Structure formats: structure tokens, C-alpha cells
Nucleic acid binder design. Structure first.
Ligand code: MG
Ligand code: MG
Ligand code: MG
Ligand code: MG
Ligand code: MG
Ligand code: MG
Ligand code: MG
Ligand code: MG
Ligand code: MG
Ligand code: MG
Ligand code: MG
Ligand code: MG
Ligand code: MG
Ligand code: MG
Ligand code: MG
Ligand code: MG
Ligand code: MG
Ligand code: MG
Ligand code: MG
Ligand code: MG
Ligand code: MG
Ligand code: MG
Ligand code: MG
Ligand code: MG
Ligand code: MG
Ligand code: MG
Ligand code: MG
Ligand code: MG
Ligand code: MG
Ligand code: MG
Ligand code: MG
Ligand code: MG
Ligand code: MG
Ligand code: MG
Ligand code: MG
Ligand code: MG
Ligand code: MG
Ligand code: MG
Ligand code: MG
Ligand code: MG
Ligand code: MG
Ligand code: MG
Ligand code: MG
Ligand code: MG
Ligand code: MG
Ligand code: MG
Ligand code: MG
Ligand code: MG
Ligand code: MG
Ligand code: MG
Ligand code: MG
Ligand code: MG
Ligand code: MG
Ligand code: MG
Ligand code: MG
Ligand code: MG
Ligand code: MG
Ligand code: MG
Ligand code: MG
Ligand code: MG
Ligand code: MG
Lengths: 159, 58, 172, 48, 185
RNA sequence: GAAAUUGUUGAAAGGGAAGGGCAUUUGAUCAGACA
RNA sequence: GGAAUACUGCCAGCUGGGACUGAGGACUGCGACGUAAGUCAAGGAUGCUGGCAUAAUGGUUAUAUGCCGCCCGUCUUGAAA
RNA sequence: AAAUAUGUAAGAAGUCCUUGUUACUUAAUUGAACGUGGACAUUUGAAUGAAGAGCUUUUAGUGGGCCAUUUUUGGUAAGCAGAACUGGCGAUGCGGGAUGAACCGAACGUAGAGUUAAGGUGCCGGAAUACACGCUCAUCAGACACCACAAAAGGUGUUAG
RNA sequence: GCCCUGAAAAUGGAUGGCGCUCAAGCGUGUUACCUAUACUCUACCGUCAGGGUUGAUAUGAUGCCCUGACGAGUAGGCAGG
RNA sequence: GAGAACAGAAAUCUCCAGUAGAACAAAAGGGUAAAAGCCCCCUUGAUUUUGAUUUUCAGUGUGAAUACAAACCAUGAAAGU
RNA sequence: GGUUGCGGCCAUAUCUACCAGAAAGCACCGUUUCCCGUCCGAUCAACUGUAGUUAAGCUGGUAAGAGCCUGACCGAGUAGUGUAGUGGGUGACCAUACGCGAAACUCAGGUGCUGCAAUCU
């Protein structure tokens, strides 16, 4: 009959990355987590203890508890037509600080600058982000660059 | 007497009538399952700072 | 696919810091309007260069008009096409009064003789054959003998009304 | 703000017609959809 | 056709009148819809709607809850408004003066209030004294105190009171209710 | 003293069913409105 | 050398033929034309003329003619079956 | 090692300054957690949309499904059996495909005028026995998606290469 | 490429039928034209929404007035009759 | 692989190479090299209390598992486990 | 710059073959009373720093070296793919339209960077 155990279908998922087996480097252990931090989740197959279920692989959540060897991460999983709160107990080997926040955090500081920076001069800022605009006009020269004319080419076999 | 065994057909139609409700989010979430040693202390800490505002309204 | 105009289309890869002034390539393109023509351009460039339209720009688009629209001309035409079971090169000769007219009858011919729709053809080259006697296909040579003349036997008048009172005559 | 203010324009069928035997191919394939660039004006006028 | 994106022909879902068939109630509503249309006072809009409310959504306010409110900072001289009935409460011993306007005062509430030289006022006497509801303190009673809501949301681990008739041990207190009898909730 | 169903009388249609829909001709019949 | 024309586009340029509609019911608005008085096609048709005043138009009904129309009820994935 | 799918983020529940509370924690008034006081407003932090958003109770029918494109298992195969995503039919008429549950087009209050879709315009039948270049002659020609089948292999028929 | 051979089944019979051969056939191009319960404009019904209106001395305040958008439907729910 | 009496294809001895080509009860897949394998030393945490959490899910139960709190212990020079 | 003790990233650091290394350091190196471990003071323990050596370790350089790393309109806008059609084809399959876009290949450039503390012609 069918089979649906805890680590089922996870053959390649928890595998270890080519020529990256063995001890986990100590920086993993030196990193620090605080309640409220955002972390991305990804299982280290060599660390069987305190391991996320496969569902949570590649999922990103917020730290809510800090314990001796682990952090508690809340993840919102959607079941049926709705989300339920889930709290995971992950060991530090299966978690890393998310960068999903840097382009913001680095942009916030930046915003504060050119906000005060400008203001002091005499305003006129504009610091919302804007999408790729279309291209403006432009003139392209021919100097040293007369257009090369190509045609399509006949069918041929080489084999 | 065999029959259809299983299908997801029409299930996301259904999930989407009333919607996939985005998670709902609160300031001050629960401390459910947070380290009991921490909480015990956090409890007296709060007792303390509260005292020192009742005190600052003397 | 329609009544053709002929376009020069000029394009290039977008500029970059380390490469401003990219090279600039032109094609003559036979299409019925400039939208089809710029599309055909990108089609063919992507068979020659590392480009697509998402990383290139059309620099210029310009319709080319026949130089002597009322001079009869013998065209050499080179085509690549796809059949049901293989792809193939062909040389046809067309006699008309403009490259544009020439290309319209080609596509017609390719459709009628070989069942090639527009998607399946590549004009490789269309060129005016200067001196006769480099004219090579007989169905054309026929028409350049000296003092050429011919009747059109069996004349067929169009009726304008459903009943006639005569009995026609195909004389001419 | 300006453009949200305008209700969606409610057009008729083109009065000339569509210029094509079949609408649901791209403009480029002798059909009717996609970016047809400046040829949009002739359409819209015939529909307005 | 129209790719609709919301139900067509959808009623707003708010009472619009009361469901009550009472002349006097319907007259108070005549009063306050006029007041609501012709003054920009928010008070009148609120009161309008409250008259529509059904009995559940009008829990009784007690005279002690009234007293509590008047203990608010800067509030003792406010005239409190209850759009519903006001009940009496022997649990407070010292009740203040004020003026209460409500739909109904019980015998003993009226007494308690009046004996402290307060004043019981109908909503329309209220209207004439305070057309923009100036200086008013609207109190609502506890809706989710009702015995019914004890059982809303019944389910494992929700902690929420069986619909049960007889109660005692031997009534729904075994298997599923304790660790030693199958499981707990 | 209903209906199914039947006799007579009157009117009408009917080239392997009949009945029905939108529409008008034809025939029969009828309301209203005018001053 | 100097024009014309085609093609595509624009005009708050002028103008003819034909069809359907005329909701609303004092005034009230935004305007236009006039030196003005005043006028108007400007927040929904009025002017002028004729015919009948009756089965004429209209309803109903039978018939005919154009095109269309399978037997309802039911269980069923699916019924005229 | 793609493409399509998929997690989180784009601020007032935000950022920075000062320095209170504890029994936790540090060699340590160290940290950690929660705070008092202070500073900065709608270009306050991408787009598009929003006939508003949130919430609570109670109850019906249902719990045989079937089909199409694409992915796809078993099977020689099936108008066969079984899954994936979407869209349909079932529950739905209307125009087209002669006919037909599911295809194309398009979803329905009672109507007038106009313009179209898909599909057509010899006659049946509303609509060019229109225009244009070719090709095709069959003593069992051919004739429009789903679709109502034809293959290997041959021809000194004819066509263009 | 078109055409021909390859190509055998049972009532008489189906490019829908007639019929069609420089097609009314096959490939391809260009115009015009026909017509859906769809699109546009308008009237009328009803549903939903947003406004306005207790002021006597006349008649519906569940009323009256203005405005916008919407309308398929088995099982089934509710509503006004 | 290259070496040493009896000793042979295979007994026991030594050196070299050796990313795991082995081993870890068992199916297979993951994992692991001063180890998770092999040899030795000390042991009973396979214990005590009662909650939270993940999978299956109705977010019931059961099974299994995760990270803490409160005991009492084991091992280690120790951090630890 | 060298070297050492503790490191971070964990091959540009590995592998094969050669050659070069001053000064300090490290090392190899001597001993067996003591603690301590062995079949064996080889490992492990202690003791000397005295008696000896750059031979090895170590560090570095060489190599149309093996490996690895980086780049490139090198291949390739190729394979594959999201979307469309009353597109072609008996079919198997295939072309076109609006997009996304590899891997191998090939050629070029590289061959540890760096933190803390002590030390050194
Ligand atoms: Mg299985
Ligand atoms: Mg374990
Ligand atoms: Mg059965
Ligand atoms: Mg079955
Ligand atoms: Mg079933
Ligand atoms: Mg020319
Ligand atoms: Mg026109
Ligand atoms: Mg027309
Ligand atoms: Mg015209
Ligand atoms: Mg067509
Ligand atoms: Mg129009
Ligand atoms: Mg109680
Ligand atoms: Mg009780
Ligand atoms: Mg009798
Ligand atoms: Mg009769
Ligand atoms: Mg009739
Ligand atoms: Mg009128
Ligand atoms: Mg009127
Ligand atoms: Mg008379
Ligand atoms: Mg009369
Ligand atoms: Mg008369
Ligand atoms: Mg009749
Ligand atoms: Mg019929
Ligand atoms: Mg039955
Ligand atoms: Mg059956
Ligand atoms: Mg039958
Ligand atoms: Mg997304
Ligand atoms: Mg908006
Ligand atoms: Mg709104
Ligand atoms: Mg229910
Ligand atoms: Mg139910
Ligand atoms: Mg049920
Ligand atoms: Mg479909
Ligand atoms: Mg059914
Ligand atoms: Mg339908
Ligand atoms: Mg039909
Ligand atoms: Mg058919
Ligand atoms: Mg016929
Ligand atoms: Mg006709
Ligand atoms: Mg014509
Ligand atoms: Mg086909
Ligand atoms: Mg042939
Ligand atoms: Mg046939
Ligand atoms: Mg026909
Ligand atoms: Mg044709
Ligand atoms: Mg209609
Ligand atoms: Mg309309
Ligand atoms: Mg309905
Ligand atoms: Mg194993
Ligand atoms: Mg180790
Ligand atoms: Mg046990
Ligand atoms: Mg149970
Ligand atoms: Mg469980
Ligand atoms: Mg030395
Ligand atoms: Mg020694
Ligand atoms: Mg030693
Ligand atoms: Mg040496
Ligand atoms: Mg090399
Ligand atoms: Mg694809
Ligand atoms: Mg297809
Ligand atoms: Mg291909």
C-alpha cells in the first residue's frame, strides 16, 4: 500500500550539496537570533535532531522563542481556504537570517538620509520607488558604424 | 461497483469563493510556548516597571 | 500574407557602459506594414546574433520604394522553404515591374505550387538580372524574344444581366 | 487620479468591421489581438 | 456579459428600521432620522442606528456601570444615554446625581437614580435638551455576557461549554474529558 | 345539473398524425376614445 | 533641377441622401449670438396641413403562408429515446 | 540545470536618541525582554485595482459525476481504466459547427435602431456565379478544425525544384 | 505539389442536399457583403445602492423625489404575493 | 600493490596507496572520517512531573517525533552531551 | 614581509614531479628518576634544551602538469519552456506569433584571501 512517513519524498531535498558534506562550519553556530528576527528555513540532513518537516523547506518565518540550541519559528501555513499559525522548533543548523529585509532596511536608512539631507537644503525629494520607465529618445551616430546588412541564410546539412 | 477514487477538481474554485483569508496579524501576539524560565522573570520585570509609574504618579 | 511594402529596418543591441555604440545591423524586409516588419526583423536577427528584442532596439525603419516603378524587369529570386518532410533552397525567376510586385507573386506561387504558407518561406535574395542571357528559367525567356506578339483566343465577355438575346461570340 | 476618474470607455463594434477573418490571432498574423501600435487609432475610431 | 467581481443585488446587511412594531419606538425613529439628516452631529447617527437594534444587541446597562462611567476624568456632569433599558443594582451603595436618558428604566433603577436627586429622561426629552447630543456619554451594555455565547465555537481544545441539559458528574465528563479516559478534549 | 364522452345543426381546415412559437393576409367578432 | 500625384495621418472645414427615437412637463443650469434690444439648435419635439370619426386603426378568434417547435413526469454523467 | 509554478519583504504595529524594571542572563548595570521621556508626517516609502472592509450565529442541498487542451500511469488498443492544473457540461438557453450535453462564438429582464462574433455569401438560404496568381481531370476526383479515418510502397500523368 | 494505383462487406444513400470542372475543387492574397439573447445608444419592468424631502392649510414617511449600476440558473435558501 | 619459513586462490606478519569505493539489526533512501564506523573505559537519561510543538488532521484521536520548564542521575579534565 | 598559537571562509587552499628557503619560530632531535601508556617509551607520559639537523615536516617557487575557481555577443538566442490559433500533417510530429531561456562545448584569465595575539635581520 501507500507510504507517507515523516521524511517521505525528501531524497534530494535533504541531500547535502556536491562536495559539501561533513562538519558544519562554526559560523552557523556563532550567529545570534532574537525574537522578531526573520529567518529562511532549510534542512541540514546531517543534523537529524530539531529538523523542520519537509513542508517548511524553503519557507520563511519570524522567530518567536530563543532556547538553548534552537529557535521557535512561527510560519503561517494555509490549509483549506485559510491560514493557521504554526510554531516550529528548529535547531540553529536549519535556519539562517533572511536577506528578504536588507533592501528595505538598507533603503530605510538611506531614505532617512536624503530626507534630512534634502530638507536641510530646501526640500524637493521623491523617495518612493518607481518601475522601469520606458526609454527616452536618443540619436545614434553612424560614424565608424555604417549599418551592416544581413540576409537570411540557405538551408544546409553539415553532419 | 468501482468509482472515482480521488480528485482535487473544483477544490480551489471552492477555496476561492470565500477566499484564502490572509493570516490576520496582531500587535502583541501570544507567548504560547515561549521559554518558561524567561516568562517567569519577564513577569516580575513587568510587575517592577509598573510599580515605577504608579510611583511616578505620586 | 498581404500586399507588400519593402522596408529597411535597422537595429542594434542596447547600449551598455563598457559597450556604448553597438554595431548596427540592417535588413531589407518585405511585409505589409511596419508592425509585421519590425517583428520579422527580430525574427531573423535572433537566427544570426545573440540578441532578442528585449535587449535590443530598432534604430530606424524606412520604406523603400521601387526606383523605376514603370520599367519592366526580370527578377532573380532566391528562397528557402519548408516542406512537409524537409527544408529546401530554390531559385525562381519573376518578371514584373517592382521587387514588391515580384515578392507578392512569389508567395502566391510558393503557395500554389508547393503549398508553402508565409511562415515557411525565407526570401534569401531578390535581385534584378541585368543582361538577358543570364535569365535562366524558360517560362520567362519566352517573353524576351524580339518583336514578340500574341493573340488571346476565345474571348469571354462578362454578362451584366442574367438573360442574353444573342448567343455570344468568343471572337477577339 | 486622472485616469481612474474616467470610467472604462464603453465602445461599440467597429463600424468598418475588424479587417480580419479571425480576431483571435495576433495582429501580426493577420489577426486582431496584441499591440498593433499606431493602428489602434483606426480601430478605436471605428468603434467610437 | 460582465465578468462580475462581487455578488449582484446584494443587500447592505444593516437594519434600516427597527424590526419592532411599536408606535412610540417608530416615533423616536421619526425624530432621530430627521435629526440625522439635518444636523452634522455624529451622535444623532449613532442613536438612530441603536434604535434599530434587536434585544440581544441592546444588553441592559446597570446603574452601577453608569456610576462607573461618571467616575471618568472630566465626566461627572455629563448626561449619560442608554438606548435600551437601565437596570438597578444593589451592589453599589452610593449613587451620584446626574441625568440619564434611556429607552426604559426599571422600577428600581428609576428609584435609585431619582433618590439621589438625579433625573430619568426619555430619548426625546434628550433630543430637545441636546440636539447635537452635546455633553453626552453613550453607554452600551455587555453583549457577549449572554448565556448563548458560552457555546459558540464549541470544539476540541476550544474550552467552550457543552450544550447540555442535566449537569453533574456522569454528564459528559469522562472519555475525552480526562487524561485517564481515552484522552482530553 | 360540470367534465370525460355522444347526437343533431352551423362554420372551417385537412397530399403519411395533430397540437405549439414570432409575424402578417383573409374572414368572423368586439371594446374604447371622439364631439 | 523643379513640380505633380499616390499612400498614411489631421481639421473644434463645409455640405447632400436615408432610417429608428421624441423619454421629460411652469421657471431654476452651463452657455452661444448680438453695440444693444433681444435672440437661440444652450438641463429630452414642435410648428403647419390633410383624411377618418368609423370596425377605419386596434383587440380577440378561426384559417392560411414564411421560418422555427421531438413527450411529459422521473432516476441518471447522459432521455425524444 | 531551466520555463511554469512557490516562501517572505516593500514602514506609524516604522526608524533614531536618552535611560527605568527583573527573581532571567553576564566577569560585570553586562545582556535579554517590556517600558518612561525626545526627534521626523502623506512621494510615509513600488505598480494596478477596490459597488468598501472586518466579524458572529445558525441552517439547506451535496457527498454516483462526466468532458476538452496541456502534463500523465496501466493497457496492442478502446466512445477503455486511472491521476495533475485550468476551463467547461451536469445546472444553460442564444449564434455557428446540417445533425449532436461538453467544440467555436457568446452566457439570457420586456423592446426599438445600429454594429459585429464564430461561421458563411451558385441554388436550397439572408449574403459578390466578386476580384487576383497558380495548381488539379480521377471508367469509384475533391471539397474546411473537434469530426465521423487510411499506410508502407509505386507512376515516363502533370507541376515547380 | 495536385492527380492516379495501392483501396474488400453486407436494405438504397449521402462534401447536409442539388449540383459543380480557367469550379461551386485545392493553396494563397485583396475587397465588399449577410447575421446572435453579444457590443453601442434609447424607452419601459424589477433588483441593489447613494442622495434629497415632516412645514402647515389635502389624500399613501412602510411614503414622495433625484441619481447610478445590475438582471442565466437544477438541488437548495429566503422574500413579496 | 609490494614484501616474510611450512603457507597453497584463501591462515598470520609489515609497509605503501586509499573521499569512503566499507560499516552503522533490518527494506530503501538520506546521513556520517581525529565519526555516526572499529577497539577499550565508566555507566542506566530506556528514569521522575506535567504542559507546548511538528507530521497524518476535523487542524479530533492514536502512533511517532521536536524544543523547553521542574527533579534526580550518568559520563568527561572540561565545554558539553 | 617571515614565523608561531587560536581562527573565519573551507581546493585560487587539493594532487603529481622537481628546486629554493636568511633570521627568529616551528620541527626533527637526546634521556627514562618521577606521573603516565604500551606486545614495542614507535604512539602516548614525563625530564633536558643540554648533546645534534635543515634531511624530512613547514613555507615558497617551477610545470604548453591533473584538479579546482572565474569570465566571455565561445557555442546558443540553440535545447527546453509559459501563452495563442477552425495553423501544416493520415499520423508520428512540425512551423509560426507574444515571452522566458539552459547544459555540454570552446577560448581566455587565475591558483588561497583574511582576523586576533606574540615574535623576528
Ligand atoms: Mg509508494
Ligand atoms: Mg534520537
Ligand atoms: Mg461498491
Ligand atoms: Mg466507472
Ligand atoms: Mg466517490
Ligand atoms: Mg529599388
Ligand atoms: Mg465608416
Ligand atoms: Mg456594413
Ligand atoms: Mg464604407
Ligand atoms: Mg473563417
Ligand atoms: Mg459608432
Ligand atoms: Mg453567569
Ligand atoms: Mg449556568
Ligand atoms: Mg335534474
Ligand atoms: Mg370557425
Ligand atoms: Mg395571430
Ligand atoms: Mg414629450
Ligand atoms: Mg413627454
Ligand atoms: Mg360611417
Ligand atoms: Mg366602435
Ligand atoms: Mg371608414
Ligand atoms: Mg391556430
Ligand atoms: Mg424543423
Ligand atoms: Mg424513474
Ligand atoms: Mg445508466
Ligand atoms: Mg435508443
Ligand atoms: Mg507570486
Ligand atoms: Mg483606485
Ligand atoms: Mg466604495
Ligand atoms: Mg451548512
Ligand atoms: Mg452540511
Ligand atoms: Mg453531510
Ligand atoms: Mg474549454
Ligand atoms: Mg444530477
Ligand atoms: Mg451553456
Ligand atoms: Mg442552431
Ligand atoms: Mg459536420
Ligand atoms: Mg435543398
Ligand atoms: Mg441570396
Ligand atoms: Mg462586390
Ligand atoms: Mg488539422
Ligand atoms: Mg510526381
Ligand atoms: Mg467524397
Ligand atoms: Mg455547399
Ligand atoms: Mg480559394
Ligand atoms: Mg435584446
Ligand atoms: Mg443597455
Ligand atoms: Mg434569476
Ligand atoms: Mg541505510
Ligand atoms: Mg574529531
Ligand atoms: Mg522503554
Ligand atoms: Mg476521537
Ligand atoms: Mg498527534
Ligand atoms: Mg635556524
Ligand atoms: Mg623517544
Ligand atoms: Mg610526548
Ligand atoms: Mg631542503
Ligand atoms: Mg591545469
Ligand atoms: Mg513552449
Ligand atoms: Mg492545435
Ligand atoms: Mg525543434
Amino acid at each position: 500500500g501507500k507510504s507517507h512517513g515523516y521524511r517521505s519524498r525528501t531524497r534530494y531535498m535533504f541531500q547535502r550539496d556536491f562536495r559539501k558534506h561533513g562538519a558544519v562550519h562554526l559560523s552557523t553556530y556563532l550567529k545570534v537570533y532574537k525574537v522578531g528576527d526573520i529567518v529562511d528555513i532549510k534542512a541540514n540532513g546531517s543534523i537529524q535532531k530539531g529538523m523542520p518537516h519537509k513542508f517548511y523547506q524553503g519557507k520563511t518565518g519570524v522567530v518567536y522563542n530563543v532556547t538553548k540550541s534552537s529557535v521557535g519559528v512561527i510560519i503561517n501555513k494555509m490549509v483549506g481556504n485559510r491560514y493557521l499559525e504554526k510554531r516550529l522548533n528548529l535547531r540553529v543548523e536549519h535556519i539562517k537570517h533572511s536577506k528578504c529585509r536588507q533592501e528595505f532596511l538598507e533603503r530605510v536608512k538611506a531614505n532617512a538620509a536624503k530626507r534630512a539631507e534634502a530638507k536641510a537644503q530646501g526640500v524637493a525629494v521623491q523617495l518612493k520607488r518607481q518601475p522601469a520607465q520606458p526609454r527616452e529618445s536618443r540619436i545614434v551616430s553612424t560614424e565608424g558604424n555604417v549599418p551592416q546588412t544581413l540576409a537570411p541564410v540557405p538551408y544546409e546539412t553539415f553532419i | 461497483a468501482k468509482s472515482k477514487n480521488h480528485t482535487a477538481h473544483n477544490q480551489t474554485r471552492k477555496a476561492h469563493r470565500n477566499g484564502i483569508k490572509k493570516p490576520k496579524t496582531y500587535k502583541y501576539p501570544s507567548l504560547k510556548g515561549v521559554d518558561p524560565k524567561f516568562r517567569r522573570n519577564h513577569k516580575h520585570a513587568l510587575h517592577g516597571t509598573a510599580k515605577a509609574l504608579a510611583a511616578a504618579k505620586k | 500574407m498581404a500586399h507588400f511594402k519593402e522596408y529597411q529596418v535597422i537595429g542594434r543591441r542596447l547600449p551598455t557602459e563598457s559597450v556604448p555604440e553597438p554595431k548596427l545591423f540592417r535588413m531589407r524586409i518585405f511585409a505589409s506594414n511596419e508592425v509585421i516588419a519590425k517583428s520579422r526583423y527580430w525574427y531573423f536577427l535572433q537566427k544570426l546574433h545573440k540578441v532578442k528584442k528585449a535587449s535590443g532596439e530598432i534604430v530606424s525603419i524606412n520604406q523603400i520604394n521601387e526606383a523605376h516603378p514603370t520599367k519592366v524587369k526580370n527578377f532573380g529570386v532566391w528562397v528557402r522553404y519548408d516542406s512537409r518532410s524537409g527544408t529546401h533552397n530554390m531559385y525562381k525567376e519573376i518578371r514584373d515591374v517592382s521587387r514588391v510586385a515580384a515578392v507578392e507573386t512569389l508567395y502566391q506561387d510558393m503557395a500554389a505550387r508547393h503549398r508553402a504558407r508565409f511562415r515557411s518561406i525565407h526570401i534569401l535574395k531578390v535581385a534584378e538580372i541585368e543582361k538577358t542571357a543570364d535569365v535562366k528559367r524558360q517560362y520567362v525567356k519566352q517573353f524576351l524574344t524580339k518583336d514578340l506578339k500574341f493573340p488571346l483566343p476565345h474571348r469571354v465577355q462578362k454578362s451584366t444581366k442574367t438573360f442574353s438575346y444573342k448567343r455570344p461570340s468568343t471572337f477577339y | 487620479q486622472a485616469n481612474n476618474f474616467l470610467w472604462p470607455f464603453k465602445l461599440s463594434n467597429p463600424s468598418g468591421g475588424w479587417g480580419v477573418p479571425r480576431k483571435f490571432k495576433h495582429f501580426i498574423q493577420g489577426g486582431s489581438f496584441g499591440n498593433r501600435e499606431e493602428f489602434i487609432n483606426k480601430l478605436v475610431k471605428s468603434m467610437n | 456579459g460582465i465578468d462580475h467581481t462581487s455578488k449582484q443585488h446584494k443587500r447592505s446587511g444593516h437594519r434600516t428600521a427597527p424590526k419592532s412594531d411599536n408606535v412610540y419606538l417608530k416615533l423616536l425613529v421619526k425624530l432621530y432620522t430627521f435629526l440625522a439628516r439635518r444636523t452634522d452631529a455624529p451622535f444623532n447617527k449613532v442613536v438612530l442606528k441603536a434604535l434599530f437594534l434587536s434585544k440581544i444587541n441592546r444588553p441592559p446597562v446597570s446603574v452601577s456601570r453608569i456610576a462607573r462611567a461618571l467616575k471618568q476624568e472630566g465626566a461627572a456632569n455629563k448626561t449619560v444615554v442608554v438606548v435600551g433599558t437601565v437596570t438597578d443594582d444593589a451592589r453599589i451603595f452610593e449613587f451620584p446625581k446626574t441625568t440619564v436618558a434611556a429607552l426604559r428604566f426599571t422600577a428600581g433603577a428609576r428609584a435609585k437614580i431619582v433618590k439621589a436627586g438625579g433625573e430619568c429622561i426619555t430619548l426625546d426629552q434628550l433630543a430637545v435638551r441636546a440636539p447635537k447630543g452635546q455633553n453626552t456619554l453613550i453607554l452600551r451594555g455587555p453583549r457577549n455576557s449572554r448565556e448563548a455565547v458560552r457555546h459558540f465555537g464549541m470544539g476540541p481544545h476550544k474550552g467552550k461549554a457543552p450544550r447540555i441539559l442535566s449537569t453533574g458528574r456522569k454528564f459528559e465528563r469522562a472519555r475525552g474529558r480526562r487524561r485517564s479516559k481515552g484522552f482530553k478534549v
